């Protein structure tokens, strides 16, 4: 395996899907016309915390998904 194998394209192509709807039209960086810069290396972090995780926390990578009410109150 070079660089992508036959299934983590799909992931590239996730996080692509879900912080391309907190984009909208206000959000992190410039978000210019080509901050893609911006949004590759935010989901580029999880490439990071995957790899020593071992996606024990993420049962399949959701950042949105309704999983995560468990504790919606605090500050935090």
């Known amino acids: ?12 192509d996730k996080i692509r899907e879900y912080r391309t ?4 039209s206000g959000g992190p960086v410039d978000a210019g016309p080509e ?17 020593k995780a ?3 926390t993420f049962p399949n990578f959701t950042f949105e998904d309704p999983k995560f009410e468990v504790v919606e109150k605090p500050q935090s």
């Open 1 to 12: 395996n070079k660089e992508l194998d036959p299934v983590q394209k799909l992931f590239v």
């Open 21 to 24: 709807k907190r984009q909208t």
């Open 35 to 51: 901050y893609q810069q911006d949004l590759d290396r935010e989901l580029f972090k999880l490439k990071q915390m995957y790899g």
């Open 54 to 56: 071992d996606m024990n």
